[PDB]
Design an enzyme around this catalytic site. Structure first.
Site, mmCIF file in Angstrom:
data_model
loop_
_atom_site.group_PDB
_atom_site.id
_atom_site.type_symbol
_atom_site.label_atom_id
_atom_site.label_comp_id
_atom_site.label_asym_id
_atom_site.label_seq_id
_atom_site.Cartn_x
_atom_site.Cartn_y
_atom_site.Cartn_z
ATOM 1 N N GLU A 1 0.850 -1.180 0.000
ATOM 2 C CA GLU A 1 0.000 0.000 0.000
ATOM 3 C C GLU A 1 0.895 1.244 0.000
ATOM 4 O O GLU A 1 2.119 1.147 -0.084
ATOM 5 C CB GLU A 1 -0.888 -0.043 1.242
ATOM 6 N N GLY A 2 0.302 2.419 0.093
ATOM 7 C CA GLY A 2 1.084 3.654 -0.039
ATOM 8 C C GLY A 2 0.235 4.871 -0.328
ATOM 9 O O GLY A 2 -0.935 4.755 -0.694
ATOM 10 N N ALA A 3 0.840 6.046 -0.183
ATOM 11 C CA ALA A 3 0.132 7.323 -0.269
ATOM 12 C C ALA A 3 -0.790 7.373 -1.471
ATOM 13 O O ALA A 3 -1.994 7.453 -1.319
ATOM 14 C CB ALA A 3 1.118 8.489 -0.312
ATOM 15 N N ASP B 1 15.644 8.397 -2.484
ATOM 16 C CA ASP B 1 15.072 7.709 -1.313
ATOM 17 C C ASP B 1 15.468 6.270 -1.137
ATOM 18 O O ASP B 1 14.661 5.338 -0.968
ATOM 19 C CB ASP B 1 13.527 7.835 -1.366
ATOM 20 C CG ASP B 1 12.833 7.610 -0.004
ATOM 21 O OD1 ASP B 1 13.426 7.776 1.036
ATOM 22 O OD2 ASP B 1 11.538 7.340 -0.085
ATOM 23 N N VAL C 1 0.046 -1.710 -4.783
ATOM 24 C CA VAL C 1 0.691 -2.574 -5.756
ATOM 25 C C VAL C 1 0.005 -3.929 -5.647
ATOM 26 O O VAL C 1 -0.102 -4.462 -4.558
ATOM 27 C CB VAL C 1 2.214 -2.807 -5.434
ATOM 28 C CG1 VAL C 1 2.857 -3.712 -6.478
ATOM 29 C CG2 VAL C 1 2.926 -1.483 -5.376
ATOM 30 N N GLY D 1 -1.552 4.958 -3.863
ATOM 31 C CA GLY D 1 -2.421 3.800 -4.169
ATOM 32 C C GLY D 1 -1.907 2.491 -3.619
ATOM 33 O O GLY D 1 -1.656 2.403 -2.428
#
Ligand SMILES: COc1cc(C(=O)N2CCC(N3CCN(C)CC3)CC2)ccc1Nc1ncc2c(n1)N(C)c1ccccc1C(=O)N2C
Length: 265
Positions: free
Chosen positions: A15-17, A125, A21, A19
């Site tokens: 998950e993530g900011a 990053d 995967v 959307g």
């Protein structure tokens, strides 16, 4: 059970900011890839840039981009699947991992970073959550959502945007108005190496107000994490984690280091 054209989206890998995967399996050919789903509404400039950089990437230690599809407001980015998951999940807390395994991953990370730098791209990053593994434990640099061009037509541009992850960020990024891209990715690779050898991060951030950072600059290597690391790799970390970016070791000089070149198990 959702799907996109010939592929079905079968499980959530992250998950993530923006959307998530998904693991994507072609019903017909049975190929399996990863799909990064981003809600353009939830920025559309940002993905334009990310896809553009993604199309430049062709190296065995860097995640491959296969193509994309905009379906209304959602962009689907088809990318290489790394079925061994993340380097983060190979680090035992307070321990690290065997030195020979750490050395191999470090060699692979340097090969991917030299590749990116040679096409004028900086990742910005680097950290264990962004370093993925294939089925034979080969490292892959992933997540190009903060990546940018630092050399174009053989001319370097200095950076000024603050970005990254505090424990991994270089001190110039906090202290200077503009800075060179390459020594900032080199510093984050040094923090990764400390993580792999000690199972612990050395400081919250590399500022004059952080005691753990002051202790390193005063060479108190009888403290943790340093006291867990053998002398040979610790001597390389002393050349990487140098405050002044123009005195910091470069990647061609890392390739000449004694530990870098030590034969291990
Ligand atoms: C099957 O592929 C993945 C699995 C997992 C995962 O949860 N595990 C569970 C444990 C598993 N085994 C490891 C070996 N062990 C002997 C047994 C357990 C490893 C995989 C995690 C990630 C996988 N693959 C993957 N690919 C591309 C991404 C992405 N994620 N995501 C989520 C990314 C995450 C960070 C940054 C970039 C990405 C990314 O862009 N892609 C394309």
């Amino acid at each position: 059970v959702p799907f996109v054209e010939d592929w079905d989206l079968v499980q959530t890998l992250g998950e993530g900011a923006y959307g998530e995967v998904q693991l994507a399996v072609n019903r017909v050919t049975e190929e399996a890839v990863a799909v990064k789903i981003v809600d353009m509404k939830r920025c559309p400039e940002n993905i334009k840039k990310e896809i553009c950089i993604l199309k430049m990437l062709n190296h065995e230690n860097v995640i491959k981009f296969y193509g994309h599809r905009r379906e209304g407001n959602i962009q689907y980015l088809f990318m290489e699947l790394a079925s061994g998951g993340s380097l983060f999940d190979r680090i035992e807390p307070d321990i690290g991992m065997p030195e020979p395994d750490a050395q191999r991953f470090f060699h692979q990370l340097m090969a991917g970073v030299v590749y990116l730098h040679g096409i004028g791209i900086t990742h910005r990053d680097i950290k264990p959550h962004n370093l993925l593994l294939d089925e034979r434990d080969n490292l892959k640099i992933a997540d190009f959502g903060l990546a940018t061009v630092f050399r174009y037509n053989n001319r370097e541009r200095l950076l000024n945007k603050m970005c990254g992850t505090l424990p991994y960020v270089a001190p110039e990024l906090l202290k200077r108005r503009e800075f060179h891209a390459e020594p900032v990715d080199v510093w984050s690779c040094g923090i990764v190496l400390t993580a792999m050898l000690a199972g612990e991060l050395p400081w919250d951030q590399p500022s004059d107000s952080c005691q753990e950072y002051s202790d390193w600059k005063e060479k108190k290597t009888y403290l943790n994490p340093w006291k867990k690391i053998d002398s040979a790799p610790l001597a390389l970390l002393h050349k990487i984690l140098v405050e002044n970016p123009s005195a910091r070791i470069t990647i061609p000089d890392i390739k000449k280091d004694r530990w870098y070149n030590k034969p291990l198990k």
